[PDB]
Design a protein around this nucleic acid. Structure first.
Lengths: 73, 107, 93, 121, 99, 77, 192, 195, 186, 72
RNA sequence: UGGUAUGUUC
RNA sequence: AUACUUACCUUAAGAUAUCAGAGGAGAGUCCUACUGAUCAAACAUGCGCUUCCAAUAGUAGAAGGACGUUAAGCAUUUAUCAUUGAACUAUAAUUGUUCAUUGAAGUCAUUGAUGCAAACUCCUUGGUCACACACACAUACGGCGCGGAAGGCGUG
């Protein structure tokens, strides 16, 4: 019924979370823009190493090479 | 807007290349493919402080007698991690991007 | 387009070749039918796992990206693909 | 190894040289290239594959090193799991002899085209 | 829209439009305001440097590179100052821009 | 019977809305359980009601756009 | 395409009421004749109506349990009847060409000249002349030795062995036309 | 587009169904087999001799070698050396093509002859024999041979042919000898053999 | 090794006796179950806290980009040239040379010769209808013939027929050139 | 570009290997130009047994080779 | 506007 | 070899080095046997240039190997789990000890594998070249013979 491109254009301006492949880097922030190669741009992101935080980051560009999934809270 | 054409303007430049295996390669550039398959001459390569696969790749190239001195090495694109240019070269004149200037003039 | 090595791999069809995989398992058998994407099919396959043991498959089909190399027989040392100045007898219109 | 590899040569000029090509594992293949492509898939004549064992690696870490050599003959190696290639040994016949051989191949190819034109008539 | 059926020789204009108004807004802001960015790489080589050029493969030219990694045996931090660098987009995990 | 291509296999798997077990990469990766709602040509599969269980205490995850390069295997639980 | 990712994108874009003229009813029921003759020498060109896989899956799910539509079946029956009439006209033209080749002017003149000289001892001479005329007729028929295929209307041979004939029967034209004949016979058995 | 380097024939846009059918047809088989045979014959027949290195020999070697003896050189005419080298080439090719086939005809009445030596009921390579029959799509290739097939099935047991001497066997072949050294055979046998 | 599926004869197969099987030894790399990059990569928030304060203190100012400045100067020069072209093109009722009669009988002949005269143009225009006025347009900065003229005839139908006869036969052959005629397009 | 020649594996039991040990034995129902494999009645084999649902689809990136368990 | 391969007759 | 039938297919595009100026064609584009500069290729050509080219006034030796021998050389390390029975150390899916029934795969290799070290033998390569068996050198060595192999630089 749905496709990842209308779901991902509608995912803009939401507190989303992105897990990486390494199980020690998870970035949770507000999505700004996303291209057709699915590169991610976030704002006021937070680092999550194995669940626990380390500090706020801000405007950040997450490459689609190292993403595993993106979630909606 | 591929920056391999920036490296095509870097002939006879005495650079270093850190590979993804971990090897630092000091040598002069001769040519580079558009797929970034770069050939180098007057080369010495060194694995710093380990990775036993990188030590095997360092020794099994002939000319070891851990700085290995080799005459001519071609390097594949996906094994290049980063390349360090000499600081005496001016980046403001080599990055003029004449193909991008012609594409902007064609618009 | 295709290139010389994929034409050489398509040349030695129906011959005893030996593959090595990326994991370390070495296969050896008769090539059934090679493709341009190097997804090659072998028959009477003898296999050596990276653990060391030796087994025998009847009909294997390996994907081209998980191949380290493949050994063709030596009589393909002299091939017309290796000729540099072979002219072309009047291609059709 | 005092070979003095050419200073401005590429893969079209390095053909029929006894290469010593390195891979990601370090499984070094020694042999003559006879063809390549865009993905750098190299055929290797009289090729040998050499490695070092895990016990020899401790001695290699800072002398003699006992490498393990297997014989592959004429193989065809892919360009994905390779890292670097160098020129180890020069071929048998020289540049002038290869030039005379290439002129003989061109004259033989022109004679073959004249024979095809004679058979077409 | 499919990529092969857009047009011929006008894909560079769409690539520049995606550069100005897409995920490339941070690499564009760093090269015009000369702010230092922190690129974390796939082998713990964190780079603090200024961006000089942009590429489709995210091949980035960096000037006044201060790179830092951590050796875990025991725990030491080793840094290096490199004047000019051409970084491949394969190694890049993430790019952070400071305000 | 006939041939069932993988795109139509995932399309029928989408229509039936069976319970889904999606595997991933090795020991770092974590097996996910959910229900498929969307996919594309690069196999970026969108799943809902996701509970993750590591390789041999599951936690809810919500709605997930799982990318293609880590997807290994899809089963109907 | 040169890349397979564009091929997969094309498959997604062509895979993702229902009584509309845009949907090919012969493909919605199944085995469209414009699909079974796509790239062969007997090609009809291109189907003007669009083909879809999601509509075919919905029609299969409806015909599994829900219901059936007789209008698309009647349209497919009319299309199969028109194509079978065109193929029967082509087979009749091939049979007329074979009958004209068997009844050529010089061949009938040679047969009449052989039969004019065909007329105990006289009965044995007439039997030998009839055997010679049969040998001449067999030599005249062996110059082509082309039969007529009873189903697909192509040309066959009697002296040809069964392996080349089995290679002939496994084509796109013959499989498609046998499937169309099976569908036409099923619809004529259901209607009558 | 596709070009066969062997048959020197072109093709349309590169279809796998056409290229697969091209390597099965008989003309490509003949040209490919003849080309491989001629290239193997050329790389065997190429006498790549070593480049000679003649040095100024020692004095005492010259006083020793020029006083011992002078040997005689034998040499033949053109047709003689041509006929001898042609006989040597046919002998080399008939030795390269031959093989010892004594175990196949020596265990012919064995109870497991139909399970190993028949080469069609073999387990590991019998599917390769049963797969490519060369199905003879020409009627003349099937109508040419009019002899029996004598296909021995696997299900032949020990009940069939119980006594191997009543069912008429063949006397085994004698050990073949070299025809150039056939004049030194003992002309007198040990025992009297009849017929 | 003894019996083959191969379509080649036995004389080819004796030449195709393959290499002996490869002598297997123990591998050196990690297996593909263990092939991965490094885990537990820490976050970049520690560099923005302590290392950024030492990094900004050593280089408070960045290097200027001469290539980006040259590209921006080229874009600004192109924008200024486009603005000057728009101001020159945006700024037929405020022209004294175009103060003739209505354009229904006023045709325009363009790409004419630079050394032509008004008498030959009037003789060419009066062949297919009576001409009321003729005016050759020139540049204001220099007194050179640009090759354009406007001829207003007495009737619109005769002027339209003259323009069709002059533009249908690949341009009217005016004595050194082929000048086509069309509407004034006012 | 080219469709892989898996026509001989149409109604036969195959055994995929996944990345060094995950041996999924199933019945090949369909494939693509990406070597994505559709298996009916899958079964995980470990050196123990584990069932993998009725139907499954397996990504061609993790697929290395496949053994034809059934005779052709 | 064509190509590749195969089977009959002269 | 001609004549005919059948099976499959009938094509991703654009271009051929770069920069500056002048002229022509109705801000943008094209052309110049148009002009200057850079670069690439080919053919010649020279730089007291760089490296190598094996005794014969002997029965040798340089480079690369043996997938050759002594050599089964010398020194080390392993050669399956579970249930139960007669005793049992015992936190285990009785692990440890002696014997056995049964259950799933079950590398061959222990004359095996790794490390160490010497000797002998045999293969492919060369200028196995022209004169002579000679007293030079702090500006360390008259590189001022005929060539060949590899390479650098410069000119047309």
């Amino acid at each position: 019924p749905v496709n990842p491109k209308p779901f991902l254009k509608g995912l803009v301006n939401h507190r989303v979370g992105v897990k990486l492949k390494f199980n020690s880097t998870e970035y949770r922030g507000t999505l700004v823009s996303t291209d057709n190669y699915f590169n991610l741009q976030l704002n006021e992101a937070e680092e999550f190493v194995a669940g626990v935080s380390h500090g706020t980051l801000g405007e950040i560009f997450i490459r689609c090479n190292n993403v595993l999934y993106i979630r909606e809270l | 807007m591929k920056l391999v054409n920036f490296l095509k303007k870097l002939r006879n430049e005495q650079v270093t290349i850190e590979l993804k295996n971990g090897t630092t390669v000091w040598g002069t550039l001769q040519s580079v493919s558009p797929q970034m398959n770069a050939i180098l001459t007057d080369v010495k390569l060194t694995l710093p402080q380990s990775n036993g696969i990188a030590m095997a790749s360092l020794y099994l190239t002939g000319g070891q007698q851990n700085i290995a001195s080799l005459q001519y090495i071609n390097i594949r694109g996906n094994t290049i991690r980063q390349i360090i240019l000499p600081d005496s070269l001016n980046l403001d004149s080599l990055l003029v991007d004449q193909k991008q200037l012609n594409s902007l003039r064609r618009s | 387009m295709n290139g010389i090595p994929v034409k050489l791999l398509n040349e030695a069809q129906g011959h005893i070749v030996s593959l090595e995989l990326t994991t370390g398992a070495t296969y050896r058998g008769k090539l059934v039918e090679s493709e341009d994407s190097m997804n090659v099919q072998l028959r009477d396959v003898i296999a050596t796992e990276p653990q060391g043991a030796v087994t025998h498959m009847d009909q294997i089909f390996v994907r081209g990206s998980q191949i380290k190399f493949i050994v063709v027989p030596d009589l393909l040392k002299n091939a017309p693909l290796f000729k540099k100045n072979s002219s072309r007898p009047m291609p059709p219109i | 190894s005092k070979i003095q590899v050419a200073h401005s040569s590429r893969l079209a000029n390095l053909i029929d040289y006894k290469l010593r090509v390195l891979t990601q594992d370090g499984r070094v293949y020694i042999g003559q290239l006879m063809a390549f492509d865009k993905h750098m898939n190299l055929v290797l004549n009289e090729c040998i594959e050499e490695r070092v064992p895990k016990t020899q690696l401790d001695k290699l870490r800072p002398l003699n090193i006992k490498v393990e050599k297997r014989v592959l003959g004429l193989t065809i190696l892919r360009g994905e799991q390779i890292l670097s290639t160098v020129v180890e040994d020069k071929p048998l016949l020289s540049k002038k002899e290869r030039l005379v051989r290439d002129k003989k191949e061109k004259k033989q190819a022109q004679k073959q085209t004249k024979l095809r034109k004679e058979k077409e008539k | 829209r499919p990529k092969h059926e857009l047009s011929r020789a006008e894909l560079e204009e769409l690539e520049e439009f995606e550069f100005k108004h897409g995920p490339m807004s941070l690499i564009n802001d760093a090269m015009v305001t000369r702010t230092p960015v922190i690129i974390s790489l796939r082998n713990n080589h964190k780079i603090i440097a200024r961006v000089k050029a942009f590429d489709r493969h995210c091949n980035m030219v960096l000037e006044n590179v201060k790179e830092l990694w951590t050796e875990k045996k025991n725990v030491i931090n080793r840094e290096r100052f490199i004047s000019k660098l051409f970084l491949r987009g394969d190694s890049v995990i993430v790019v952070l821009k400071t305000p | 019977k006939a041939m069932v291509p993988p795109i139509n296999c995932i399309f029928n798997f989408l229509q039936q809305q069976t319970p889904v077990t999606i595997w991933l990469f090795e020991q770092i990766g974590i097996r996910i359980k959910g229900k498929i709602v969307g996919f594309d040509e690069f196999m970026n599969v969108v799943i809902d009601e996701a509970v993750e269980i590591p390789v041999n205490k599951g936690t809810p995850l919500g709605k997930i756009l799982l990318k293609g390069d880590n997807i290994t295997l899809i089963t109907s639980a | 395409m040169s890349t397979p990712a564009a091929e997969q994108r094309k498959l997604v874009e062509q895979l993702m009421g229902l009584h509309d003229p845009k949907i090919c009813k012969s493909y919605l029921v199944g085995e469209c004749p414009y699909d079974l003759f796509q790239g062969t020498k007997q090609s009809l060109g291109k189907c003007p109506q669009m083909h879809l896989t999601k509509h075919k899956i919905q029609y299969e799910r409806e015909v599994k349990q829900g219901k059936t539509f007789p209008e698309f079946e009647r349209e497919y029956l009319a299309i199969l009847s028109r194509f079978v009439n065109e193929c029967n006209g082509q087979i009749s033209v091939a049979l007329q060409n074979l009958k004209h080749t068997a009844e050529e002017r010089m061949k009938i003149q040679q047969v009449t000249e052989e039969l004019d000289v065909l007329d105990l001892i006289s009965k044995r001479k007439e039997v030998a002349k009839r055997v010679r005329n049969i040998t001449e007729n067999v030599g005249q028929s062996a110059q082509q030795k082309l039969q007529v295929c009873e189903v697909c209307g192509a040309y066959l041979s009697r002296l040809d062995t069964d392996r080349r004939l089995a290679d002939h029967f496994l084509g796109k034209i013959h499989l498609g036309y046998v499937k169309m004949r099976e569908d036409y016979d099923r619809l004529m058995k259901n209607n009558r | 587009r596709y070009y066969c380097e062997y048959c020197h024939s072109y093709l349309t846009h590169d279809t796998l169904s056409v290229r697969k059918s091209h390597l099965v047809g008989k003309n490509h088989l003949r040209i490919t087999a003849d080309y491989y045979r001629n290239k193997a014959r050329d790389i065997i027949n190429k006498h790549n001799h070593k480049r000679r290195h003649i040095g100024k020999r020692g004095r005492k070697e010259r006083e020793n070698s020029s006083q011992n003896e002078t040997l005689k050189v034998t040499c033949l005419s053109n047709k003689e050396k041509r006929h001898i080298m042609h006989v040597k080439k046919m002998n080399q090719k008939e030795l390269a093509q031959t093989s010892i086939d004594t175990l196949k005809l020596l265990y012919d009445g064995s109870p497991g002859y139909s399970k190993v030596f028949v080469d069609a009921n073999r387990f590991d390579i019998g599917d390769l024999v049963k797969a490519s029959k060369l199905p003879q799509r020409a009627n003349e290739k099937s109508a040419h041979h009019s002899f029996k097939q004598t296909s021995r099935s696997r299900d032949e047991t020990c009940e069939s042919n119980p006594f191997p001497r009543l069912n008429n066997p063949k006397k085994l072949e004698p050990p073949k000898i070299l025809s150039q050294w056939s004049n030194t055979i003992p002309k007198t046998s040990i025992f009297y053999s009849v017929d | 090794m003894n019996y083959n599926l191969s379509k080649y004869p036995d004389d080819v197969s004796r030449l195709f006796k393959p290499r002996p099987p490869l002598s297997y030894k123990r591998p050196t790399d990690y297996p593909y179950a263990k092939r991965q990059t490094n885990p537990n990569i820490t976050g970049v928030a520690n560099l923005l806290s302590t290392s950024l304060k030492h990094y900004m203190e050593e280089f408070p100012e960045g290097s200027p980009n001469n290539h980006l400045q040259r590209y921006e100067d080229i874009k600004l020069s192109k924008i200024k040239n486009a603005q000057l072209l728009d101001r020159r093109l945006q700024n037929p009722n405020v022209d004294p040379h175009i103060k003739d009669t209505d354009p229904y009988r006023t045709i325009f002949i363009g790409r004419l010769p630079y050394d032509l005269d008004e008498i030959e143009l009037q003789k060419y225009f009066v062949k297919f209808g009576e001409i009321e006025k003729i005016r050759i347009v020139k540049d204001k900065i220099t007194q050179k013939s640009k090759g354009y003229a406007f001829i207003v005839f007495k009737d619109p139908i005769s002027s339209k027929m003259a323009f069709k006869e002059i533009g249908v036969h690949r341009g009217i052959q005016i004595k050194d050139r082929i000048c086509i005629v069309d509407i004034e397009r006012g | 570009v080219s469709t892989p020649e898996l026509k001989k594996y149409m109604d036969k039991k195959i055994l995929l290997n996944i990345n060094g040990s995950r041996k999924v034995a199933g019945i090949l129902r369909g494939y693509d130009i990406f070597l994505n494999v559709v298996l009916d009645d899958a079964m995980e084999i470990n050196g123990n047994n584990h069932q993998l649902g009725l139907q499954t689809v397996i990504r061609g990136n993790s697929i290395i080779s496949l053994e034809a368990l059934d005779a052709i």
